[PDB]
Each structure stands twice: as structure tokens, then as C-alpha cells.
């Protein structure tokens with residue numbers, strides 16, 4: 001059931017912005033690790049004395065890495081004379097963010113029809129304003145409201161990347177590509193799911209995306225065409241294995257973004273290319289499941305991909321779940337940084353053709369039960 | 381003239397420690413970029429709740445990358461119960477360091493016979509104590525005194541990497557190597573060279589290493605066998621091209637480490653391997669000199685390396701200078717991070733054989749005049 005109750009017109013995910021202490025080093029590690037191209041910059045070379053910002057791109061996926069310069073570089077400026085290309089940026093907010101959380105996502109940015117309307121309707125419906133709408137170079141409008149923890153939902157709208165960014169020179173832009181094409185979903189961990197759901201659903205009009213005892217309870221908010229998907233988790237206390245959600249909240253100093261799920265047009269090529277570079281600057285993957293997993297996946301997805309492909313899934317350590325309209329392939333990286341907080345998910349969806357509809361396959365919650373069962377089978 | 385006046389027995393450079401906000405991402409960028417192996421760790425996986433520390437190695441070169449966890453992880457601990465493997469570490473000092481300077485070197489660590497004596501004699505001779513000597517696991521003694529800015533000279537001594545670090549598992553350690561073998565010199569920028577020289581020379585007994593109007597004035601302190609080399613720069617104000625030293629001090633918020641010079645056993649292989657990876661996660665190099673440089677280098681170093689090698693120097697953009705005992709090959713990277721502060725120098729020294737004596741060739745100051753002259757020649 002999709003009551004299509006969006007309070008403003010939303011399009012798709014536009015970019016994800018990381019706040020860090022050195023944008024250069026994070027951007028180059030991510031670029032090599034995920035096979036994303038260096039496509040735009042805003043920094044000293046472009047006259048920005050406030051923040052260094054570098055954009056990586058793969059397909060429609062846009063990763064933005066920003067860090068503050070010394071405030072002394074811009075001490076004579078005021079907000080009307082700023083040289084920041086992103087007007088919401090704040091030295092104190094960014095330093096406080098990185099030192100409280102470590103490396104992580106500051107903004108989940110969705111493109112909308114009208115960022116001023118989106119901000120107005122949002123706050124009129126309970127959103128906590130973060131940065132009021134500002135029109136950049138008569139071309140682009142940008143506005144921010146609080147999402148959870150210190151993460152903001154960022155609205156961007158185009159009358160026709162951002163003003164004041166520069167296209168990178170082709171000799172500095174190497175066309176890496178491991179198959180990743182767009183952001184599928186972005187997931188937050190909070191201490192209490194109920195109030196978090198109520199707040200966000202309340203100011204966007206996003207509806208609960210339907211689904212179908214380890215870790216969490218979760219629920220997925222979705223826009224009208226279910227292309228913008230925002231799952232949210234809370235811990236399940238009092239178990240025997242400590243919830244990784246509660247571990248997240250302890251090491252992250254509170255609520256925040258847990259994982260980004262990136263869609264690949266060919267998860268086999270992606271995971272081969274990423275695994276090649278794991279121990280030479282790229283990303284580590286979570287430990288593979290026992291072969292009993294792949295010894296049971298013929299009995300569940302054997303109509304969807306051949307035994308040659310299921311064997312190919314066994315080498316790369318890929319998980320496979322299934323809804324009632326589609327099948328989901330997925331795997332999880334180790335944490336992107338020092339703390340056991342944010343990680344990335346690689347996914348590919350098969351089914352639900354009309355274009356592919358959003359969320360085809362679900363999000364893999366079944367893989368929890370399948371994993372534990374596959375563990376016990378292997379053990380004995 | 382070498383009066384060999386060291387006030388305590390010094391051996392060689394032991395490691396360089398970077399303070400950052402995320403150790404993981406800097407370490408992986410440096411590892412791929414410079415061809416250094418991941419060899420030791422101290423972090424949550426090893427029971428350290430205070431700081432994450434990862435060591436990269438290439439030959440005798442040891443790069444340490446450290447960042448703080450949330451203080452909340454270790455709030456119950458006191459200095460006697462600490463789980464930090466490096467006792468000098470301090471959350472507040474490290475956060476304040478990264479937010480004031482951005483990415484940079486916190487410690488230049490030299491190995492000594494007796495770190496307690498080294499610290500005692502040092503402070504008795506004007507050194508500002510930074511961290512008193514502490515004996516780690518009855519095996520290693522560690523002590524710190526201020527060097528310049530927020531950089532400390534770190535003494536380490538072994539009765540027989542550090543206690544509480546772990547050897548990395550071979551499946552996580554990929555044996556990268558681009559030829560780099562040891563740290564040659566570490567260079568500081570200060571606002572006033574005179575007082576800086578007087579202070580450091582005063583508490584170490586290091587002597588002025590002999591040399592032989594753009595940029596700087598500099599002077600090199602050296603230990604008895606001139607293997608530990610600490611050059612220091614100050615700006616030359618009132619020119620026409622702004623001193624890069626003064627630019628350093630403005631963007632770094634004061635004095636600090638300017639460049640690390642890394643010796644390669646084969647600078648041609650090193651620079652080929654590093655240049656291959658420049659735009660896929662590695663390091664950028666400063667713009668090459670005009671071919672007029674290489675058109676004049678036959679007339680100055682033509683007795684040292686063939687015209688085939690001088691042509692090989694032209695492709696890689698390598699500089700060549702010459703003292704009266706040796707010849708120096710060198711090239712400079714772009715800044716390692718967001719700010720125009722720290723950069724790395726790759727060098728190889730030929731001559732002064734007895735083993736090779738320290739500083740063989742000098743440090744390339746002549747390449748300043750040669751560069752400007754080679755510019756003007758090309759232009760007309």
C-alpha cells in the first residue's frame with residue numbers, strides 16, 4: 001500500500017556529504033577503494049577560503065568530502081561576503097561533528113522541485129530547521145533540516161554540481177569505475193525508533209515501506225515512487241549478543257548514519273574489483289558466510305540465477321535474499337574508518353520490472369535468520 | 381668540521397607519527413601511495429580504548445598514524461590503568477592539534493641508548509618537557525620534549541615496534557614496496573630561525589652541518605655521525621614572490637614540520653611506481669622543470685650518470701644537485717593533505733663512500749638558482 005503522501009515533490013538522492021578532518025585523504029581512499037571518479041572541487045584553488053570540498057562520482061552516485069580550513073583564512077569575511085561554496089558550512093559545527101563522531105555522513109541530500117517550498121512545508125510540519133534556503137547564483141537553492149543526531153536532510157533544487165565548484169582537469173580525473181551506479185538507501189541508527197519515525201514521517205509525508213530476533217528493530221520510510229528510501233534502526237536490548245546498533249551508538253556518541261547502500265549494475269564485477277584492492281588501500285568486507293549458506297541457496301534462489309552464478313556468489317561472499325516480487329544480492333564492508341560505526345553495502349536488485357521499482361527484494365532482513373541457521377548447519 | 385658534541389648517544393630515526401582524525405583512511409592512502417606495508421596496529425581489536433594507531437613500514441622507514449577514539453570509551457581509566465599503548469597520547473592535545481593544524485607530524489622519534497638519560501640531560505639543557513620517561517613493559521622507554529610548534533622530539537630506547545602493538549595478520553598485510561628504505565631528514569618551518577636553532581642545538585648538542593635569494597634561510601642540525609639531520613627554515617620577508625615558508629606558517633597556524641625526505645635505493649623505480657598511482661589514490665608531484673633544466677644537467681652531472689639516465693630523469697621530473705663530495709637526486713610531492721603545509725621529498729644520494737656518510741650531496745639548495753635560470757632560458 002502506497003498512499004503517496006509526500007508533502008512536496010521529491011526526485012531522487014542527489015549526493016552524500018562526509019565531514020572529515022582532511023578531505024583529500026578520505027576522498028583518495030574512497031576513490032581508489034570504490035572506483036569513483038574525481039569530478040569536481042571547491043577549495044583554495046577555486047577561491048574557497050572556508051572549506052575544502054571534493055566530489056567523487058560513479059554513475060549517478062555523488063560522494064562529497066569536506067573539511068574545514070583554519071578559520072584565520074576567512075576571518076575578515078561575513079556570511080554575505082563568504083567564500084564558502086556551501087553556505088550551511090560552519091567551522092565550529094564541522095570540527096565539533098568530526099571530533100564527536102569521527103568520520104561520517106553529515107548530509108543526505110535529495111533533489112526536490114523547490115527547495116524553498118520543501119524547507120517551508122517541512123518546518124511547518126515539525127522539522128527542526130538547520131540552514132534556511134539560500135539561492136546560489138540564481139541557479140540552485142539549498143536548504144537543510146535536522147534528520148537524526150547531527151545528520152541533516154539536505155534539499156537541493158535546480159531552476160534549470162553546485163555553483164563555485166570547478167570541473168576537475170582531465171589529467172587529474174582518472175576514469176575509475178567498478179560498476180556502482182546510484183545510492184539505493186541510506187540508513188540511520190537511533191536510540192528510539194518510534195519518535196524517530198514519527199518526526200521524519202511527519203515533516204516529509206514519507207510512508208512506511210512494507211517488509212516481508214537478532215540485532216535491531218527497523219522500519220523504512222519511502223517517498224511516493226519509493227526511490228528515496230530511508231530505513232532507521234533501534235537496538236534490541238537484553239539479548240545475549242550485544243546489538244551492533246547499541247555498539248554503534250556508544251562508539252558514534254549517539255544517533256547517526258549507519259550504512260549507505262550503493263547499487264551496482266554488476267555486483268560480481270564490483271565485488272571482484274573492490275576485493276582486489278582491499279589490502280592495497282581499499283575497503284575490507286565482512287567475513288563470508290559458511291559454504292552451507294551457498295549449500296542452501298540453490299534451494300531458495302535456484303530459479304533466479306544459475307548454479308554457475310551461485311558458485312560465483314560463493315567466491316565473492318555475496319548474500320542473497322528474496323521478497324515476493326524480487327531478489328536481492330548484497331554484501332557489507334567493514335567499517336569505513338577507525339570506529340565501528342558507518343559501513344557501506346553493495347547491492348543489486350533483480351525483478352519488479354515495469355524501469356525497476358524501488359526496494360525490489362526488500363533489504364535482506366531474512367539473511368539474519370538464514371545466516372544463523374547456516375552457521376549451525378556448518379558447525380555440526 | 382664535526383665537533384661531535386651530542387649530549388647523549390643517538391642512533392637513527394626510529395619513526396614519524398602523524399596525528400589525524402581518522403587513522404584508517406590516512407594510513408591506507410599513504411600505504412598505496414608510497415608503497416608501504418601495514419605491519420603493526422594498536423586499536424580496539426588490541427584492547428586500546430584510547431587511540432587507534434597503525435604502523436606502515438618500508439625498509440627502515442616507519443610511519444605511525446594515530447587518531448583519538450571517543451573519550452567515553454576510556455572514561456573509567458586513569459593514567460595508571462590506561463589502555464593506550466602510547467602513554468604520551470592525550471585526547472585534548474590530539475584533537476586540538478588536528479583542528480589547529482590539519483593533518484601533520486606530531487612526533488619525530490629518534491632511537492637513543494637511554495631515553496631516561498636523554499630526557500634528563502635534554503631538559504637539564506633547556507628542553508621543554510612534553511612527556512616524562514615511562515618504561516613500557518620493562519622493555520622500552522619513551523620520552524618526549526618540545527621541538528618546534530606542537531611537534532615533539534621523541535626519544536625511544538630498547539634494553540634489548542612498541543609493547544601492546546600487534547603484528548598484522550599476513551592476509552591483511554600486502555607486501556607493497558616501491559623502493560623507499562629510510563628517513564633521510566625531517567625539516568621544520570619556524571617564524572625565527574635563530575632562536576629555533578639555539579634552543580634545539582642547546583639541548584641535544586647537535587652541530588651545524590655545513591652547506592655548499594628565493595624562499596627561505598635555513599640551517600641543518602646534525603648528530604655526531606650526521607645520520608639524524610634536522611633542517612629548519614624561516615621565511616625571507618619583503619620579496620616579490622611570497623615565501624612558501626610564510627605561506628606554510630599562515631595555513632598551518634604556526635611553526636611545524638614542513639617536509640619529510642625519504643631515501644630510496646632506486647629513485648627511478650620509486651618515482652615510476654608513485655607516478656603510476658598519483659591520480660588513483662596516491663600522491664601528486666610538483667610540476668616538472670623545463671627541459672632546459674635537463675638541457676643543462678649534462679653540463680653539471682654528466683660525469684655521474686649517463687645521458688640515458690639524465691633522459692630518464694627528464695621523464696620523471698627528478699632534480700639533481702651536487703655538493704663537493706656527492707650528488708643528490710630529489711623530487712617533491714604536492715602537499716599531503718588539504719592545506720599547503722606538509723609535503724614529502726624522495727631522494728637518493730650517490731658518493732661519500734667509506735657505508736655512505738650522512739648528507740652526501742647536501743639538500744639541493746642550488747636547485748633553486750638552477751630552476752629560476754632554467755625557467756628564463758626556456759622562456760626566451
Ligand SMILES: Cc1c([C@H](O)C2[C@H](O)CCC[C@H]2O)ccc2c1c(=O)n(Cc1ccco1)c(=O)n2C
Nearest residue numbers: 187218219231244259332345363364365367368371
Ligand atoms: C545492515 C544489514 C542489513 C540491512 O541492510 C539493514 C536494512 O538496510 C534496513 C533495515 C534492516 C537492516 O538490517 C541486512 C542484513 C545484514 C546487515 C548487516 O549489517 N549484517 C552484518 C552484521 C554482522 C553482525 C551484525 O551485523 C548482516 O549480516 N546482515 C545479514
Ligand SMILES: Cc1c([C@H](O)C2[C@H](O)CCC[C@H]2O)ccc2c1c(=O)n(Cc1ccco1)c(=O)n2C
Nearest residue numbers: 567598599611624639712725743744745747748751
Ligand atoms: C624543500 C626544497 C628543498 C630542500 O629540501 C630544503 C632542505 O631539505 C633543507 C634546507 C633547504 C630547503 O629548501 C630544496 C629545493 C627545493 C625545495 C622545494 O620545496 N621546492 C619546491 C618549491 C616550489 C616553490 C617553492 O618551493 C623546490 O623547488 N626546490 C628546488
Ligand SMILES: [Co+2]
Nearest residue numbers: 187261345363
Ligand atoms: Co541495507
Ligand SMILES: [Co+2]
Nearest residue numbers: 567641725743
Ligand atoms: Co629536503
